[PDB]
């Protein structure tokens, strides 16, 4: 479940 700026 995520990690950046998307």
């Amino acid at each position: 479940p995520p990690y950046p700026a998307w």
């Epitope: 479940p1 995520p2 990690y3 700026a5 998307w6």
Partner: antibody, heavy 120, light 110 residues
């Protein structure tokens, strides 16, 4: 028609580096992320990392953190992955795949991959 | 950290509904695993079909859909077509990296 072209094969020697190219076209290169996968028969697929054309900001699979280096060139619209201290364990097929994240979210388009054979 | 596992091989007939599944070993496959499904055809023909568990990639035939069946993610081909005979991979996101499954060889008797 969206496409990604990659060399079909590359022969390189153990202990050297290779720079695999993945030419993109058919869209705006900077609006989609580019991911690289490693395949060896019997071993399924292995996600190496991801890059974004704009920031150049990467997210590396921890196992390939110092083995691979993702990079891109805006004018030519091509993504690059450099493998560094090559050995027999790096012989595999390397694919680049596009992924959309703002208006959808998934892997969509894949190049045919470059079969890398590391031997002397 | 997670071995994703898919059915070895499945066989269906033209016109039927076939379901491919995907087991995660950390636990039940959720909506934050953003399960992705990928179709592989001869000559390294890799195509994305579903992303984020149930989001069909633009252009993908409607007979393909992704979902969740119990504690796993699943791919459902409604009215399986002779051209769907391909290998299907599963891809689960795990907080900062994807892990792929072995892949399921699908046969739609053509």
């Amino acid at each position: 028609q969206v496409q990604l072209q990659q060399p079909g094969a590359e022969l390189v020697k153990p202990g050297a580096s290779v720079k695999l190219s993945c030419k993109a076209s058919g869209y705006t290169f900077t609006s989609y992320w580019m991911h690289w996968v490693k395949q060896r028969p019997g071993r399924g697929l292995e996600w190496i990392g991801r890059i974004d054309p704009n920031s150049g900001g990467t997210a590396y699979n921890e196992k390939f953190k110092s083995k691979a280096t993702l990079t891109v060139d805006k004018p030519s619209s091509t993504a690059y992955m450099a493998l560094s201290s090559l050995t027999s364990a790096d012989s595999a097929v390397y694919y680049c795949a596009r992924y959309d994240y703002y208006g959808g979210s998934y892997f969509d388009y894949w190049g045919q991959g470059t079969t890398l054979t590391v031997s002397s | 950290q997670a071995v994703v596992t898919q059915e070895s091989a499945l066989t269906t007939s033209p016109g039927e509904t076939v379901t491919l599944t995907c087991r995660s070993s950390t636990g039940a496959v959720t909506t934050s695993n953003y399960a992705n499904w990928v179709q592989e055809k001869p000559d390294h023909l890799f195509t994305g079909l579903i992303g984020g568990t149930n989001n069909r990639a633009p252009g993908v035939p409607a007979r393909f859909s992704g979902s969740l069946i119990g504690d796993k993610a699943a791919l459902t081909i409604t009215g399986g077509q002779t051209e769907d005979e391909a290998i299907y991979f599963c891809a689960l996101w795990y907080s900062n990296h994807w892990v792929f499954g072995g892949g399921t060889a699908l046969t739609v008797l053509g």
